Point group: D2
Chain length 298, copies 4
Amino acid sequence: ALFTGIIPPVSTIFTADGQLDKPGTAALIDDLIKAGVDGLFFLGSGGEFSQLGAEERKAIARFAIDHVDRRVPVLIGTGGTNARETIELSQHAQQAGADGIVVINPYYWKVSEANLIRYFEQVADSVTLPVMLYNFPALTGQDLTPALVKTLADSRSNIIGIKDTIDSVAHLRSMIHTVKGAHPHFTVLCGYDDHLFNTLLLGGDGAISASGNFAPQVSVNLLKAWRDGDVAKAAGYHQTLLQIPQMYQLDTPFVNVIKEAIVLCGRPVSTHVLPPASPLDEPRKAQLKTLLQQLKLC
Amino acid sequence: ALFTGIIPPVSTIFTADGQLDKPGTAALIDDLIKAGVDGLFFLGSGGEFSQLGAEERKAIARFAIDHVDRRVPVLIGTGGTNARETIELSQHAQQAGADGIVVINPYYWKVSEANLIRYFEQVADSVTLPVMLYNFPALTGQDLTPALVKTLADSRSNIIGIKDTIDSVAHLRSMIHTVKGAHPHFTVLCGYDDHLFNTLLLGGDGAISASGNFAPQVSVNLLKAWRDGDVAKAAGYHQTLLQIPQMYQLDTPFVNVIKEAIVLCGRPVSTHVLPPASPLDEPRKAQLKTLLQQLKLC
Amino acid sequence: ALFTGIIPPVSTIFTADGQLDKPGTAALIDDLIKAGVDGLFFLGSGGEFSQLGAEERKAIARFAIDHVDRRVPVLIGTGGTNARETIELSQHAQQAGADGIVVINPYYWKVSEANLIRYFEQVADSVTLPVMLYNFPALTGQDLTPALVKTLADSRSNIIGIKDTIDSVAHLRSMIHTVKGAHPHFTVLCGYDDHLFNTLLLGGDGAISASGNFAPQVSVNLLKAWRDGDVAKAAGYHQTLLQIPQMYQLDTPFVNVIKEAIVLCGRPVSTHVLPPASPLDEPRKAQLKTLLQQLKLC
Amino acid sequence: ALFTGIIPPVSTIFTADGQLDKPGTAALIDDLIKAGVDGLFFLGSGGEFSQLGAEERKAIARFAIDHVDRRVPVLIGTGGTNARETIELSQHAQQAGADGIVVINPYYWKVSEANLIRYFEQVADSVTLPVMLYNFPALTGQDLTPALVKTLADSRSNIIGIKDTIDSVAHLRSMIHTVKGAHPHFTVLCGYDDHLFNTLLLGGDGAISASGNFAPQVSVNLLKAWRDGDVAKAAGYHQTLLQIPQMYQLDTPFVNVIKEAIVLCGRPVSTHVLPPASPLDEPRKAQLKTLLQQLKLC
C-alpha cells in the first residue's frame, strides 16, 4: 500500500505580494519532515490550488519537489475543472519527479457518471505515476461513492487510493469495506483530523488533514501508537484531534486559520492568502491562540 | 436598464483539435444578430469557460468582441475560482472593448458572506464597465439570495443586473421584488428558457438561455409579442419554450446537445466539446432530432 | 380524466376550542361551490391533517362530504406515518361518501422504494375509490419521481392522479411526459398557484392550491379562459397568481395567512389554527391586507 | 446530570395481530436491566412511535413503566406532529409514573423558529418532569442547532438534555461546547452506536442507540471501561460499535433488523413490525446473522 500514514496537505506560503514565499515554504516542509510525517501533499484544498493559475501551480510543485529532495513521498494535487489542464499538470508533476498525484472530480459541472469514469481513466492514462482520488463532496457537489471508486480501482491499476474528505463514519466504513474488500492494498486516507483514529480502527490507512501543518506530532504520535499496538495512547491523541476542528469555523475559507496556527505553534511565516480568501482579523487570531493554548499545542 | 431582452449564451465552436473554430463561431454570431437578439454573452456555462484556460478565454473574447464589431452589446463571462484571474479577465474584457462582464460566485469554496461581498466589490472596482451577477446554485452550491444581491446593488453602482439560473418561480419573483424594488433599473434575466414568459410577467427583463443558440426566433418573437402587448401570441411561443428543456436531459454536461441542435436547426459547425464533456452519441442525437421536429424547430 | 380543474385544498375552520367550526367550514364550502370550483379537497396540508387525530379527521370528513352533498367531487386526504391509520381513514372516506382519497408518502422514515410501492399498493387495494398521490418533498424529504409515479399507475388502475407540490417546471413537465405518456387520463394537478398556467400549457390538468380558498375566482377564471381558447385573458389571471405567493412567506406554517386572507376577502370565519401553528400577528395581517389590496382581491 | 450512560431505545414487541406483546416486551426489558443499562427509552424511533396511535402509545408506556417498576430510569417518547397529542401523551407519562419525556421537533411542517421555541416551551410547561430533546434531522428535515438547544435550555429549567441523532463529529462537539458550556449538567447522548466513544471523549454523557437492544453489553462494557480509566478496553468495544451499523443498511426502516438481531442474539420474540415497515426476508436475515457471527455477538 502506497501513501499510508500521515500526509499533511501542506500550506503554500506566500509573501505579501502574493508570490511563492520560498524560504517560508521550505521551512514548513523541513519542520514537517523532521516531525516524522510519511509524505507531503502540495496543492490540495489547503494548498490553495483553486486560487492559483496553471503556471503558478507548476512553479510551486517544482520548488516543493526539489526541496523535499526525495526525503519522503511527494503528492501533487493536479485537479480542476479544465481536463486538458489536469493532464498538463499531471504530466508536469511526473516529469518534475513527483511520486504521485491527487485528483479531485470536476466541481463546476457535476458530470455524468460515464463522463466521470472517462475523465479519471484519461488522467490515469496520461501518467505512469500512482493516482489518488480526492472526494470532497461539500465543495464538489458530487460524491465519489464507494461503488464508483471500486469501479475506478477495477479499471486502472494506477488508481490506488482516495482522500475521503467527509464528516461521516458511514462513508469511511463503506469506502474501506467496498474498495479494500476488492483491492486490499488500495489506500484510504481520511481528510478530517477527527476521523483518523476511526479510519485506522476501521482498517483504513491514515489522514491527509489540516492539523498536519501546525500540530503534526499529534497525528504522527497517534499513528505510531496504533502501529505499536498501544490503543490507549492512540486514543489520548484522538481526544486532542477531536477538538482541533473548532478552529476551522473561524473563517471560510480557513486556509488563513491554518497558516495563523503555524505561526502560533512556533514557525514564523507570512500568512498571506490568495483572494477570495482574506486575512484573519485580530479577534479571531486571539481566539485561535486560546484554542491552541487550551489543547497545549502552543 | 442595460442588457435587457434576449441575450444568448453563445456556444464557443471548436475544431476537432479543440482549438477555437473562427469561421464556425463567426457564422453563429452572425446567425444570432440577424435573428434579432438584444445582445450576446460569450464564455458563460454553455460557452465552456470552466474548461478553458485564461489565455484561451482572452483570445476567444477578443475574436468574439471584434467579430460582433459593436452590432449588439457584448457580455463576457470572466468568473472562476481564482479571483486574481477574474480581475485579469475582467480588465482584459474592458480593454478588448466588451460592453459588460458577467461574474459567477466562486464555486469551489463556498466563501463566507463577508468574503463573497468583498469578492464582488473587488471585481466591480477592477473595471469601469457594467457588472452582471451570475447565480447558478445547482453548479456553484451557493445561492445568491435576493437580499445578498440587493446588498451588492446598494454597494456598487456598476453592479446592475443578474443572470438568475434556477428552476424557481419564487426565486425569480423574490429577486425582482427585492432588488428592483430598491433599484428599478437593475436587470433581471432568467437563465432557463421555460421561465422567460414568467420573468416578463413578473416585471423582469429577459433571458440568457441555451435555446437562444439554435432557436433564437422563439425567444425573440416572445419578447416582441410581449412588448407589442400581444400576450396570446407571447404565450404561443412560451408553449414551445416550456418543452425545449427536455433536450438538456440527453447528456451531462449538455453543451454537446446545444451544438448538435445548432447543426440540426440549419447551421453546419463542428460540435467538438472540451473534456470532461464528450461527444453526443448517435442514439441521443436522433432523439434530439425528433424533439426539434416535434417542436417545428427544424 | 378524474378530478381535473380547480380543486381547493379547503381550510378546516376551528373554533378557539380547537374543535371543528361547522357553520364556518360550511360557509367556506358554499362560497367555493358558488365560485365554480371543480371539486373540493379536505384535510390536505392546508387542511391541518397532521395536527389532527384519526377520530377528529373522520368527523371532519363526514361533516364535509355531507355538507357538499354531491354538488362537486370530494377528495379526502387520508395519509400520515401510521399506515394502519391510513387504511382506516381511507376506508372510512369511501364509507362516508367521498369520491376519492389523496395519499401523501410517509414523511418520518423515508421508507425504501420497495416499502413505498407496497404502501401505496396496500392503501389503493383497501378501497375501490380513485386514489390521487400527493407529492410534497419540501415537507416529506422524499420526492415521488415521475418514474415511481408511473410504476404506481402501471401497478394499480385506481391510482389515477397526483398533486405535485413543487416549485419546479421540470418536475411538472417530466411528470406529465412520463406518466401521462403511458396513461393519457392520469390527472396531474400542481400544488402551487403560480404553476397553474404552466401546468395547463404543459398538458396537465389543473391545480390544488391555497389561493382557491380566498381567491378562487382567479384560478376558476383562468381555467375557463384557457378552455375557451382566450389565452391572453388566461395570462392576465396568471399574472395575479404569479404574485399571490409572496403572502405565504409571512409565517411558517402559513395556514394562518390563508384563513386571515379568507376573512380579508369577505368571509368572516375563525382564524384559529392548531398547535404548533400560531395566530398571525397584527403587523403581518396588515402586510397581508395591503398585498390583497394591491392585487385587487379585496 | 440526568439520564447519563447507556439508555437503549427499546423495541416494542408486537404479536402478529399488531398488538403489544407484553411477555415479549417484558422479557426484552428484563434482559436489558440485567445487562446493566442506565435507563430505558420507550416509544423512540426504533420503538415505532410514528406507526402507533395515541391510545396504543399510552397503553405501551403504562405497561413499560409498570414492568420496569422503578429498577432503572424510564423515558417515554411523546412527540409527533399533533402538538395537542404531544401534551396529552406527555402529561399521561408523568401521571403513569415515567421519569422523563423525550420530544422530537414536529416533522411534517418545519415550523418557524418562533413556533418551534413556543412548541417546546409549552410541552415543557405541561409537565413537571425532565424533558429531553430529540434531534434526528435525516428524518425531520429540521436540525435542532446547538444555539437553538442552548436557547431552549436557557428558557426552561426542565429542558435538561438531548438525543443528538446524526453521523457528525462536528454537530456532537458543537452541541457539547455550546450547551454544556452554559449548562454543565445538560445531558448529551448520541443516537448512533459508532459515536458513543467520541461522545464520551468530547465530554458528552452516553448514548441512546439501536444496538442497546441486541448487544447491550458492548456499550455497557465500553462505558464502564471508560469510567474506570481503562481507555484501551473501551476502544476495543468501540471497534465493535464501529462495525455494527452495516446491519442497519439491510432495510429502510430497519426496526425489523433490530428485532431479528434480538432473536439471533438469544431472546426469541415476535419480530412483527408495523406498516409501512415489513418483514425482513430470509436472505437478509442470513446476512444479519453472519454480521453478528463475525462480530461475535452470537
